[PDB]
Amino acid sequence: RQFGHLTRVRHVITYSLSPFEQRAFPHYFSKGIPNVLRRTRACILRVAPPFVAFYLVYTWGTQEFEKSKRKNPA
């Protein structure tokens, strides 16, 4: 497979420019950083809470294990 016999296209225009005629990193800080946060606010709630529990189960996994080797009053 290659270009030429994939599918159909009709009434579509494409504009584009050389790289040399534009800076590589414009608006990186200015516009990127909100887009980072917007990318963040759409994903954290479905990614973190597993790892949140993991941090806790990693915590309680040690403490209970830590106590068990410590003796009892007898």
Place this chain on the structure above:
Amino acid sequence: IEKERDVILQELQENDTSMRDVVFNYLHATAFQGTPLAQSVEGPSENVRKLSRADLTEYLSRHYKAPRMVLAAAGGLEHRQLLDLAQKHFSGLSGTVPTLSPCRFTGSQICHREDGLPLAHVAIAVEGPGWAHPDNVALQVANAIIGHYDCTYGG
């Protein structure tokens, strides 16, 4: 003015068929983007449906002026038969205007993808030097070094 205003809009439908003229219209519109030269010659439909007698009056009132006009002729005549007629008729011309902005060049790509057609007219080009620049003589050769061909030459 109103009749022709329909004639124009009839043609911008026609030039959809004039695929060669489509390309050069697109091409000039890219490299010279943002400048006046990116404009077409016939113009958008919109301005043709907003044009005025007065804008033409102003346009006429500024560009048609003797210091920026030329008369020329050839054939079985004499240069002095003619010189009186210009001194006769065009002597009444208004013989008295901005200059040029250097129209830059851009390297940019444009692509009007359309698979429903038989073929694809294509164009590519670069900066040209201009008129007075002498190396244009050389380039007209190189265009002819590569020459041309269209589906008919028995060579």
